[PDB]
Amino acid sequence: DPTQFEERHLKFLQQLGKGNFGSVEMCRYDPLQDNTGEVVAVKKLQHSTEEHLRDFEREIEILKSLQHDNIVKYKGVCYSAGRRNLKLIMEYLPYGSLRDYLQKHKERIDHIKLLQYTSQICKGMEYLGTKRYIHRDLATRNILVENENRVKIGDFGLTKVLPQDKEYYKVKEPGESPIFWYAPESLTESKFSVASDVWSFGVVLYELFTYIEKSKSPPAEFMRMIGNDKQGQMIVFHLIELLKNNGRLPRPDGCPDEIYMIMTECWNNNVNQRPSFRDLALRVDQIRDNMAG
Ligand SMILES: COc1cc(F)c(CC(=O)N2CCN(c3nc(Nc4cc(C)n[nH]4)c4cccn4n3)CC2)c(F)c1
Domain spans of the chain?
1-92, 93-289
Give, for ligand 1, the residue of 14, 24, 141 to mutate: max count of ligand atoms closer than 8 Å to Cβ: 24
Residues in the chain: 293
30 catalytic residue (yes or no)? no
Atom 14 of ligand 1, nearest CA residue: 16
Q: What is the resolution of this structure in A?
A: 2.5
Whole-number Å distance, alpha carbon 83 to ligand 1 midpoint, is 27
Atom 30 of ligand 1, nearest CA residue: 96
Q: Tell me if domain 1-92 and domain 93-289 are identical in fold.
A: no
Experimental approach taken: X-ray
Give the CATH H-level superfamily of domain 1-92.
Phosphorylase Kinase; domain 1 (3.30.200.20)
Residues with CB under 6 A from ligand 1: 16-19, 22-24, 41, 43, 72, 90, 92-94, 96-97, 141-142, 144, 154-155
CA dihedral (91, 95, 99, 102) in degrees, to 10, reads -150
Give the CATH H-level superfamily of domain 93-289.
Transferase(Phosphotransferase) domain 1 (1.10.510.10)
